[PDB]
Every structure is written in C-alpha cells, then in structure tokens.
C-alpha cells in the first residue's frame, strides 16, 4: 500500500525480447512494472548516500575584527605601509585624508593612510564534495501482492532493499516466491557529482552547482586549512569607510546566513548530519524479469465465499483497491477476480495485482485493478456467494491521453533525454529520439544556462513572435516549436 | 532629539512549538489551535494520503 497512495506513481508495462525493461527511478516517485506473464512489482528509490566527502572551501558567513591599526604619511611622501599589510589574517585598505598644520603633518595636502584589522571567522559553510564512485543508491523492490506488507519488529519478508553503487551496479534481488529480479543500474549517469558540491550550513545542507559554489563572493578557505587565518576575499565581508577625508575606519558586514539562504533558492535541500543523504534525483536501471515468475500459478480457484472487509477505494492513478477476506476451503487458492459489464458479457478492466491468491483463510488480501472509464462491476468469487461490486470511473479516454501526454512532457522537462529510458524496451525509434534529444538538450542548456523562469518566458514569447512573423514556412514552424517548448519549460521550471 | 519609534523590523528569529494537523482527502481542511494565535506562523499544503 506504499506505492499506491504516491501521486507520482508510474506504470511501466511490457518487456522486450530478453525480459528486460529500462526504468528511471526518482526519489519522490514510484514505478510499478507489469509484464505479460510476470508479477507486478513496485520500485522505489528510497535513499541516496554520498560517503567520505572531501571539503574544497569553507566560506565565511560571519566574521569580526579585533586589531585595528592605521598608518599615515604626510602629503607628497608616498603611500604608507603597515607590518600587518603583509599579514594574511588582516584586512587592509589604502585611502587619503586631509592633512595640514592642525593635523600635524606640516605640508597641507592629501596624505596616504592605510588601516588594517584582524579578520576572524565566527561561522562558515563547508562546501564538501564526494567522488562519483562513493555514491550508494538504495532501491526497495516489493512484489505488489495483495499480501500485507507485515508489521515491524517481527519480520521484513516483503520489502527487498538492494543497494547499488558504481562499483557494483548490477545487483540481484531474491523475492520470496517470485524468483529473482536483476537490476542493471547506471549510477554514474545520474547527478554527475563531479560538478556538484554538498553545501552544509549551520544545521541545513544543499546540493549545489560547483562553479556556482566557487563563484560565491564570500571569504573562503581552501579546505585543507586547519588553522584558518588565510581567508581569500576578506574584502567582501568588511567595509572601509572614510567619511569625508578625516578618519578612516573598517567594520564587518554582519552575518551572511540569511543572504546565503536567499542565494540558495533553486538548490535542492539535502541532509548532511548523520551522513550525506540525498533524497533527490533519479537513477536509471535496466530491469531483468527472466528469473521472475508469478507466485502460486499452480493453484486452483478458491470456490469459496469472499467478503469485502474494506469498501472499494479509488486511488489517484485511475485504479481501485479492494480488501477481501476468504471464508472457504483450500486456503492457498486463486481469487476469481473479474471486472465485467452489468450482463457479465465482456471483460472491461484489468486487475493490476496479477494472480491474487489467498495464503490464509482469515488473512485479508487487497487487490488492485484498473476498471474502465464507464460503469463497471467487480466480480469476486464463484456462483455460490459471488460478490458483484458496482463501480463508476469519472474520467474519459481523451482526458487520460491528455494527462499521459502531459506526464510524458513533464518527464522530459525533468529528465531531459533520460526520459527516453523510462520505459524503453530497446527499440530504434527510442534510440533515434534519444540522440536527437541529446543534441537539442545540449543546444538548449548552452543557450539557457543561468536563466530564470521569467527570462525563459520572455525569450519563448520573443522566439514565438519571431517565428509567427517569419517569411520561411519551415523557419516559422521551427521557431514556433522552439518558442512553445521554451514557454512550457519556463512554466514547468524551478520546482 | 526626542525620536519616536515608527516600526520595528525582525532580522533574526527562532521557530519553536512546531506542530502539524491534517484532514485527509475530500474532508476539508485541518485545524490547529495554533492558528488562532498570531505569534504562530502557519502554512497550508497537501500531502499524499
């Protein structure tokens, strides 16, 4: 019941010659895969771990100054110098002051002045990095039977958690009663962690671009420094003020925690307290169903009386789930489940819980099925005591096609050119489309890198207008397509 | 001389007494006794249930 109830559920149906299928697993989503003669499975990516992170900078978000020193030279005598001006733990600046007989110089001009203060860091943000080889994705595979997933502290015989790492990217999960499932994942084509930084603030962490992290205008330490005292852009966290030309002072600019939070908008928040846990991103895996068989296919129909212990509840994916107990003989038996019309003359829906069986008499089993969009009837059992359950589905086929197309477009928006692997069975059209998407995505990412969603909307409108007011028909169509796609991406971006 | 306070802005805060309430699908909106108090910051959202 975990994959049911997740709005981002995905239905992957079919396998190629070879009983494998390509699926992309996201952290907030679920993939339910159905084959012609295979048990339905639920796939969730529940944990991404980065191990042994290495720091590369320690930007300072709050500093202070303690030893302010000033040096002055009378006018015409050149710039002054301070000993601290060669100290790297000191911030210095050169300016001018008005000098004369009253001041104490004796030459009536503008004398150079330099003030230096010791820069000390009170709070910093660590930009750790991880090697792409140190990632570890945890994926749970559940056989999606009506069988209850069990309660904790006693048994975990239902969920199967397989850890995937770049070194061991091919792993096998032995699902009790269903054979084994082999996942051939490619964790090296996920986030590209070589260009990512694990940015950890006081108690919060984000996953951020590495060039963005290296371009931050705060003082930083190289990350190999244990004593600090060698901050680089100390000038960015201090302000030197010479009101008029009388006295030169310096002060710190205050805690940059809130400004940094504002700067982190659009960065996904990760966890870095007890290890580096990333509940964000996807994983492309190839799923092998060769050694995966339905459980209890050598069973006879129950020929008993079922009772619905939990009324039919509709999910947000178009299917229905019903909870039925069994009061009959021959406990391990197949459940006679059909979804027909009123006259029981046609089979209208398909139960996506393929081969429901009753392991124990009083143990309830909850079947999931996909009824048709019209009126339909769920028939459970055989002639003596048969249950006929009416149900009505509100949608329509045209609406379903629209929603499926929208979900595909959204998948392309997030997994640009990796969406082609979401339910691919190999194919040649899929390969050609993936190559074309890779080229177009390279061009689009080059032309739209670092641009906000409002800028994307503006550029899309401009390009659409240029295309509409174009001489060439082919150029007009291409520009209109580019503009409309840009508008869709700017409306769907920053999520 | 003799200044008068016009407004007092908050630059640093702390959040405590965090509490959540939920009303599952189609049954309306959740209720927190904290929403009656104006020193609590509140937000409404939907979760999958």
């Amino acid at each position, epitope marked *: *019941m975990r994959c049911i109830g997740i709005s981002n559920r995905d239905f992957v149906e079919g396998v190629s010659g070879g009983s494998w299928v390509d699926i992309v697993l996201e952290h907030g989503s679920c993939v339910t895969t159905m084959a012609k003669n295979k048990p339905t499975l639920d796939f969730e990516l529940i944990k991404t771990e980065a191990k042994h992170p290495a720091t590369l900078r320690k930007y300072c978000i709050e500093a202070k100054l303690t030893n302010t020193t000033t040096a002055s030279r009378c006018p015409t005598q050149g710039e002054p110098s301070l000993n601290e001006e060669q100290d790297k733990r000191f911030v210095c600046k050169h300016s001018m002051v008005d000098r004369g007989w009253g001041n104490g110089c004796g030459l009536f001009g503008k004398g150079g002045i330099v003030t230096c203060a010791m820069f000390t860091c009170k709070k910093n943000m660590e930009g750790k990095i991880v090697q792409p080889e140190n990632l570890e994705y945890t994926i749970v595979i559940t056989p999606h039977s009506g069988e209850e997933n069990a*309660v904790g502290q*006693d048994t975990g015989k239902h969920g199967k958690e397989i850890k995937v790492t770049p070194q061991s990217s091919i792993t096998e999960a032995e699902l009790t009663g269903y054979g084994t499932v082999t996942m051939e994942c490619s964790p090296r084509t996920g986030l590209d962690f070589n260009e990512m930084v694990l940015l950890q603030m006081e108690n919060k962490a984000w996953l951020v671009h590495r060039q963005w992290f290296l371009d931050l205008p705060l003082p930083w330490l190289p990350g190999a420094d244990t004593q600090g005292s060698n901050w680089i852009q100390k000038e960015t966290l201090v302000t030197f003020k010479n009101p008029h030309a009388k006295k030169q002072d310096v002060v710190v600019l205050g805690s940059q925690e809130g400004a940094m939070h504002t700067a982190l908008t659009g960065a996904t928040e990760i966890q870095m307290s007890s290890g580096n846990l990333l509940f964000t991103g996807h994983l492309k895996c190839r799923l092998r169903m060769d050694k995966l068989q339905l459980k209890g296919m050598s069973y006879s129909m129950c020929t008993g009386k079922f009772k619905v212990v939990k009324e039919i509840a509709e999910t947000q994916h178009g299917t229905i789930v019903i*909870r039925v107990q069994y*009061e009959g003989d021959g406990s391990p038996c197949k459940i006679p489940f059909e979804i027909m019309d009123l006259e029981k003359r046609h089979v209208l829906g398909r139960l996506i819980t393929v081969n429901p069986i009753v392991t124990e008499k*009083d*143990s309830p089993v909850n079947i999931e099925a996909e009824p048709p969009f019209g009126d339909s009837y769920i028939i459970i059992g055989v002639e003596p005591g048969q249950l006929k359950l009416s149900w009505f589905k509100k949608g329509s086929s045209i609406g379903q096609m629209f929603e499926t197309t929208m979900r595909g477009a959204k998948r392309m928006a997030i997994l640009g050119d990796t969406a082609w692997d979401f339910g691919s069975l190999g194919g040649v059209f899929t390969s050609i489309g993936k190559a074309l998407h890779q080229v177009f995505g390279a061009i689009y990412g080059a032309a739209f890198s670092g641009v906000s969603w409002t800028m994307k909307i503006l550029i899309g409108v401009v390009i659409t207008w240029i295309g509409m007011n174009s001489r060439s028909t082919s150029l007009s169509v291409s520009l209109v397509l580019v503009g409309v796609v840009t508008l869709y991406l700017g409306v769907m971006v920053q999520a | 001389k003799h200044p008068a306070t016009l407004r007092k802005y908050c630059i640093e805060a702390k959040l405590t007494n965090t509490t*959540t*309430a*939920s009303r599952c699908p189609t049954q309306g909106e959740p209720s927190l006794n904290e929403e009656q108090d104006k020193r609590f910051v509140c937000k409404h959202s939907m979760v999958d249930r």
Partner: antibody
Amino acid sequence: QLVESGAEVKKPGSSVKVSCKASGGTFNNYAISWVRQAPGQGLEWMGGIIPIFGGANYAQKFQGRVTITADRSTSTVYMELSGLRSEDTAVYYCARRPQSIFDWNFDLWGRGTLVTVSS
Amino acid sequence: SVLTQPPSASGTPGQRVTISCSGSSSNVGSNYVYWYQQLPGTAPKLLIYRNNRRPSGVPDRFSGSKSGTSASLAISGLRSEDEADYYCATWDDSLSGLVFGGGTKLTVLG
C-alpha cells in the same frame, strides 16, 4: 523509547494534559494512541494521532472532551481531557503503533499516568 | 457492539487454556484481532498481533485463534503467570475506533 508524564492529581471539573515523549524514529514513523484504564476496569481507547501528520481521531465517547496533539519540535504527544469528573479517574497509556489504517499492534507502551480525581 | 469477552477464566498449570472473544461483522471477522495481557499494576502487553501472529517477545507456547466472527488465544502449557486480565482489541468499522473487549481475568489454580 516511549516516556510518559509524571503522576497528576486533579480536581473535578478541571482539565488535565498528559505528556508522552517519543523518540525521533517513533515520531516520524509510527502512530500514538491514548488508552485509559479505569480503576478496576478494562482498557478503553480514547484516540490517536499520526505525529508527522497530526490529524487526531477520537472515540465517539470522547468527542469534545479529549484533545490529542503532537509537538514536532520536542517530539512529544499530549492528551488533554476536559470536564474531569469522578468517572474520569483512571490510568492513561500512550502506545506506539504503525500508521496504517488496518494494524493496531501496540509493540511499545509507556508506563501510565495516574490521573487521580480526588483529594 | 463491544467485543464480548468472558469475565472469568480458570485453569491449572500444565494445561492448555484459550480465551474466546466474539465480535460483530464490523468488530471481528472484518479486522485484525489483537490480544493483550495486562497484569495488575502494569501496562498491557501485546500478546498476538495481526490475526494470531506471535510477536518475538511472547514465547512459542503463546498462540491465538481467529474464526469467522470470533477470536481465541491459545496457551501451550500453563502457569501462575497466566493469571491476569485479558483484552481483545480490534478496530470497529462502524464504531470508528479501536474497541477492546470486556476484559478476561484469567485465574490459575494452585
């Protein structure tokens, strides 16, 4: 991993709040229900709540008389009983259960707070 | 209504004893049945969860039975330890709440 509040002796017509402090794992992963056992009487279910979700449900006998809430910051669950009376005297328990709507297996319990309605 | 349960139970050490809890179509026979042992001056302990599945804590001698509209708890071997109040708790769909039984005080002779 579940610790309840200390003993409380109250007076008729008052209101009593009971504290049950769970751990982080039990707060974000399990539900917590309030069962009160009257002196020399059987167990009774008052209500429960999914602390992470916070929507509380109560027995039909306790509508408008019991309030159950969670403090996600301190990871605590509270039960507040209004209109305390002679029959409200009992021991109160907080138990940890899964947040599924079918399983009520209390594999963890506190120690009970004796809400003694007397002098 | 509530799960009717036998107020009085009696047994002798070394003897197998079971407790009967009868509910309605919405109390029992439509929801899992949980059995709890509550000794005097102590909080109830979960004896069998789901439909008569033993938690690791309870020894194998403990077990329970579930039927169409009633449940039962089986004791393999008997002792003075089984002298306590017994409760059968099950979610009621109509009552919309976890409704225990009336409570069975099991008395062990000796």
